[PDB]
Amino acid sequence: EKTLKERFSEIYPIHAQDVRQFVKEHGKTKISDVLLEQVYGGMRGIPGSVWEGSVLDPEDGIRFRGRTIADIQKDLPKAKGSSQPLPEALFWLLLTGEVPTQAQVENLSADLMSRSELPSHVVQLLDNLPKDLHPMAQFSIAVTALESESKFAKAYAQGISKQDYWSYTFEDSLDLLGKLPVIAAKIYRNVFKDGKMGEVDPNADYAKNLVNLIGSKDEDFVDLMRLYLTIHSDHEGGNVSAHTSHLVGSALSSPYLSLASGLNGLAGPLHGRANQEVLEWLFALKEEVNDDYSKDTIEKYLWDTLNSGRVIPGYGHAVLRKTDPRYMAQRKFAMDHFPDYELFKLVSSIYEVAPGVLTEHGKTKNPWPNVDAHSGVLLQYYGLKESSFYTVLFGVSRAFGILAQLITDRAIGASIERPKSYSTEKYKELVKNIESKL
Amino acid sequence: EKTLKERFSEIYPIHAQDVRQFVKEHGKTKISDVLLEQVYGGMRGIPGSVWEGSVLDPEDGIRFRGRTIADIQKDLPKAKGSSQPLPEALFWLLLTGEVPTQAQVENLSADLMSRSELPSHVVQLLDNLPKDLHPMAQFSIAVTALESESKFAKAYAQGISKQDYWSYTFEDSLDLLGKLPVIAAKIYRNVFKDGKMGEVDPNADYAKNLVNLIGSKDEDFVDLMRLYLTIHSDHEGGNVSAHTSHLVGSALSSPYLSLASGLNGLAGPLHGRANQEVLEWLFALKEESKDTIEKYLWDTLNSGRVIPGYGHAVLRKTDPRYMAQRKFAMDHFPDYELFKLVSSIYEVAPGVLTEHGKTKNPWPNVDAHSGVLLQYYGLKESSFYTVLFGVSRAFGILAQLITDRAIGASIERPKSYSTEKYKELVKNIESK
Ligand SMILES: CC(C)(COP(=O)(O)OP(=O)(O)OC[C@H]1O[C@@H](n2cnc3c(N)ncnc32)[C@H](O)[C@@H]1OP(=O)(O)O)[C@@H](O)C(=O)NCCC(=O)NCCS
Numbered sequence: 059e060k061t062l063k064e065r066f067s068e069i070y071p072i073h074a075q076d077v078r079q080f081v082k083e084h085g086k087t088k089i090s091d092v093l094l095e096q097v098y099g100g101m102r103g104i105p106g107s108v109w110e111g112s113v114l115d116p117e118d119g120i121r122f123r124g125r126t127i128a129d130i131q132k133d134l135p136k137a138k139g140s141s142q143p144l145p146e147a148l149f150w151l152l153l154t155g156e157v158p159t160q161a162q163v164e165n166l167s168a169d170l171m172s173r174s175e176l177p178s179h180v181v182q183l184l185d186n187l188p189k190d191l192h193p194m195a196q197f198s199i200a201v202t203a204l205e206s207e208s209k210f211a212k213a214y215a216q217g218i219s220k221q222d223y224w225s226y227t228f229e230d231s232l233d234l235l236g237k238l239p240v241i242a243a244k245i246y247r248n249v250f251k252d253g254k255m256g257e258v259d260p261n262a263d264y265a266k267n268l269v270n271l272i273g274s275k276d277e278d279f280v281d282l283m284r285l286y287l288t289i290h291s292d293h294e295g296g297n298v299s300a301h302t303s304h305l306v307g308s309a310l311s312s313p314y315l316s317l318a319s320g321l322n323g324l325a326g327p328l329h330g331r332a333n334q335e336v337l338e339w340l341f342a343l344k345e346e347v348n349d350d351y352s353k354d355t356i357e358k359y360l361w362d363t364l365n366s367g368r369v370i371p372g373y374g375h376a377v378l379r380k381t382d383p384r385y386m387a388q389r390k391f392a393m394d395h396f397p398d399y400e401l402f403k404l405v406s407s408i409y410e411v412a413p414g415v416l417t418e419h420g421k422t423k424n425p426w427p428n429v430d431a432h433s434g435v436l437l438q439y440y441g442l443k444e445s446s447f448y449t450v451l452f453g454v455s456r457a458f459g460i461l462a463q464l465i466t467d468r469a470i471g472a473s474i475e476r477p478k479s480y481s482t483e484k485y486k487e488l489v490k491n492i493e494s495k496l
Numbered sequence: 497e498k499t500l501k502e503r504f505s506e507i508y509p510i511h512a513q514d515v516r517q518f519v520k521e522h523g524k525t526k527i528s529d530v531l532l533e534q535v536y537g538g539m540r541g542i543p544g545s546v547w548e549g550s551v552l553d554p555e556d557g558i559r560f561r562g563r564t565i566a567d568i569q570k571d572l573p574k575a576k577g578s579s580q581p582l583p584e585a586l587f588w589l590l591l592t593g594e595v596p597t598q599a600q601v602e603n604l605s606a607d608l609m610s611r612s613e614l615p616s617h618v619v620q621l622l623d624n625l626p627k628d629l630h631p632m633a634q635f636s637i638a639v640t641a642l643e644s645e646s647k648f649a650k651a652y653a654q655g656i657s658k659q660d661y662w663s664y665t666f667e668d669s670l671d672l673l674g675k676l677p678v679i680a681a682k683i684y685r686n687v688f689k690d691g692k693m694g695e696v697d698p699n700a701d702y703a704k705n706l707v708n709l710i711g712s713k714d715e716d717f718v719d720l721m722r723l724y725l726t727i728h729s730d731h732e733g734g735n736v737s738a739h740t741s742h743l744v745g746s747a748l749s750s751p752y753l754s755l756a757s758g759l760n761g762l763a764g765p766l767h768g769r770a771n772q773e774v775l776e777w778l779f780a781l782k783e784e785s786k787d788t789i790e791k792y793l794w795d796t797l798n799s800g801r802v803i804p805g806y807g808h809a810v811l812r813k814t815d816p817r818y819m820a821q822r823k824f825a826m827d828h829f830p831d832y833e834l835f836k837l838v839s840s841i842y843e844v845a846p847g848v849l850t851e852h853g854k855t856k857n858p859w860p861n862v863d864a865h866s867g868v869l870l871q872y873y874g875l876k877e878s879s880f881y882t883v884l885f886g887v888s889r890a891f892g893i894l895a896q897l898i899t900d901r902a903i904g905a906s907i908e909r910p911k912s913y914s915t916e917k918y919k920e921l922v923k924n925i926e927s928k
């Protein structure tokens with residue numbers, strides 16, 4: 059059967075021609091205004107990214123190439139002996155728009171694992187970094203240190219044509235993906251454990267390799283990581299980490315430098331820590347309520363939180379009008395594996411009463427939980443209790459969506475991202491002339 | 497006299513109130529349209545950034561707080577015995593909008609040098625990185641490794657008020673700036689020399705300490721570095737490195753992670769790494785008259801490659817940073833062979849690019865002329881040239897980051913769609 063690169067090589071020229079024809083016929087059509095408040099407000103609401111792999115459906119949640127969470131659960135092949143799709147399978151879908159066969163996924167997993175050996179200088183670098191250097195900083199350092207392996211950078215120096223960029227971008231992306239579970243596990247073992255790490259199983263999948271190297275053989279934990287890494291793999295192109303990766307990549311920096319920059323964006327406390335924020339809030343609630351999770355006790359705690367001017371972390375969507383299907387998938391995992399786990403009972407008790415309380419409070423348009431309201435409790439159950447590592451896991455997942463778009467951008471020859479800026483003094487002059495009309 | 501931090505603490509509340517009133521009274525005014533071709537064309541022409549220190553005119557080039565490069569050479573204080581501007585003097589102007597006195601610049605240089613000592617774990621990591629790992633990758637690695645020292649990161653975890661973010665951002669920024677010449681010289685000495693490092697002179701300026709740590713006390717080389725680090729320091733808010741640093745910083749990553757990300761964008765061959773690409777392209781042409789130059793330009797274009805150092809996203813005429821560098825060469829070494837080659841290409845390349853018919857700007861940018869000046873003084877290792885660009889551009893990057901935290905600027909987060917969804921959006925727009 060065709061490999062991922064072979065199938066992509068057949069699909070990308072069709073997409074490239076489609077984009078060229080679309081811009082030729084409709085490029086002059088106005089799709090938005092830019093108001094002054096938007097340039098001073100982080101460009102909120104401005105269409106500013108072409109991102110093929112995922113789009114948020116306001117009724118049905120995130121869609122990956124048109125498929126909801128329920129669709130990917132039904133449609134993607136599963137690991138042998140499991141009901142969880144693999145993140146490798148979703149990566150195939152993100153890049154091609156097509157669902158791979160089980161045999162195609164197995165071959166892709168084997169290709170990734172064949173590329174998983176860290177160069178000696180990266181092992182040495184990681185082993186000697188201080189334990190107080192944050193795991194996300196260690197992560198982006200290690201990814202950047204792989205730039206010496208970059209096939210795109212070496213080929214660009216040899217003078218390849220623009221029409222060939224995508225091929226080397228693809229190879230660098232798979233080389234990088236193959237190493238992410240090893241980098242992440244090495245950081246985990248060095249910072250939080252004894253530094254001792256096993257070896258990659260050449261027949262294991264990406265999530266299984268990650269969990270085994272982190273230090274667990276529990277097949278249910280493997281299944282949890284397959285779920286976690288699938289559902290976090292992509293969420294549009296406007297968010298800081300996806301946008302940063304696209305921007306750096308648009309200057310023809312390699313996938314290593316592009317992903318490292320995206321990871322630094324994900325490391326920002328306003329972007330990649332929602333899981334940890336929920337967990338901290340759950341722990342503080344548990345202490346304050348003295349382990350009492352009854353309806354009356356929880357509702358009073360939620361009313362006091364909202365009445366004091368604070369939000370319920372993980373609840374309330376700007377756009378999505380129902381519970382995130384990624385939340386429901388994690389709830390189902392907990393219901394099927396550990397329904398009596400005390401921390402899950404707290405999460406579930408909140409789910410039963412929070413939407414009603416938020417609705418009556420009247421300050422939350424879409425009073426439903428997101429993926430981050432449920433992820434930490436599942437990680438805690440399997441012993442991954444070190445919350446300062448959670449964004450590393452997020453990056454190991456989101457790298458799939460980031461690299462899929464980076465390959466696509468090189469395949470279509472997307473141009474450098476370079477908007478215009480002005481100072482406040484010059485915006486005042488611009489606005490004065492617009493309002494005066496001359 | 498007032499320190500930079502003291503003066504900034506007086507001006508930022510006034511800027512904050514000014515922005516708030518401006519957006520309150522004029523926020524609904526439309527300043528641009530977004531056409532489909534712009535979202536599919538890198539957002540070219542979209543006003544998408546607020547950036548105070550510098551504004552780029554397509555015809556006239558860069559202005560720093562309203563001043564051209566020539567204005568900067570006249571208005572800012574210089575080092576003793578020198579006619580070149582100091583980058584730390586421009587940094588003062590970028591952050592405050594005001595020209596520092598000579599004594600204020602000297603005090604700022606001394607503060608930067610007082611913060612220049614690298615932690616042991618950073619020295620050790622640099623000493624152990626392979627010599628074949630590109631210097632820009634080593635540079636962003638070293639900057640990221642300083643995150644363990646971040647005062648902003650520690651204060652944020654301790655729960656400081658949003659109103660106090662700027663103070664820790666400011667301290668991290670000056671801590672980081674003070675270390676950049678040491679990191680850059682360490683990379684140079686390790687990769688190309690014996691790895692041995694001299695000591696920082698507490699009383700020398702930023703560019704002089706960089707050149708001295710690289711190993712040279714040539715006074716004209718020091719003057720070149722003063723000019724180089726000044727003119728590369730900022731190019732408004734929409735260039736890839738500045739924009740990347742703003743984006744990452746807007747999620748409250750520290751100055752270390754924001755700068756490291758900006759450096760990774762600067763490392764792209766369509767961005768700052770074009771200065772290495774230019775030197776390598778010049779040397780390949782030399783190894784291989786108007787006819788021979790024109791043939792080499794066409795052979796490059798016909799191979800599906802860009803002419804490095806020509807074109808620009810915004811500029812539509814010759815870059816004034818190119819002219820400032822030509823002027824330096826005319827005043828110091830007009831007969832230098834590599835300078836004459838760059839000048840000979842300037843006579844031929846714009847015509848070829850115009851006939852080629854693709855670029856919107858057939859004129860050279862800063863990267864066409866920077867490497868040749870470094871070559872004159874014996875800095876022959878072109879894989880180091882973008883590190884120097886990064887040492888400079890950190891000034892403009894960090895000035896805006898401090899300003900952004902002082903005013904509480906928003907997360908940058910536009911909306912994306914797939915091509916399938918853009919088609920639906922366009923169809924509905926055109927039906928109405
Ligand atoms: C700087 C640069 C990236 C700006 O990109 P841009 O805003 O999209 O430029 P344009 O609008 O003029 O691009 C239109 C076309 O002309 C081409 N072009 C632009 N500058 C070119 C150059 N110096 N050589 C060859 N082709 C060039 C572009 O690749 C593009 O081709 P395409 O339609 O097939 O995709 C571009 O000019 C470039 O690649 N320059 C060479 C690298 C360089 O010197 N970078 C330093 C910039 S300070």
Ligand SMILES: O=C([O-])CC(=O)C(=O)O
Nearest residue numbers: 476731734735736809861
């Ligand atoms: O302005 C740009 O887009 C690129 C450039 O010249 C710079 O950043 O110095």
Ligand SMILES: [Cl-]
Nearest residue numbers: 293294297298
């Ligand atoms: Cl996101």
Ligand SMILES: [Cl-]
Nearest residue numbers: 297298329909
């Ligand atoms: Cl975001």
Ligand SMILES: [Cl-]
Nearest residue numbers: 524525526527
């Ligand atoms: Cl208007």
Ligand SMILES: [K+]
Nearest residue numbers: 215773776777
């Ligand atoms: K080259």
Ligand SMILES: [K+]
Nearest residue numbers: 297298301908
């Ligand atoms: K963004």
Ligand SMILES: [K+]
Nearest residue numbers: 475735736739
């Ligand atoms: K940009």
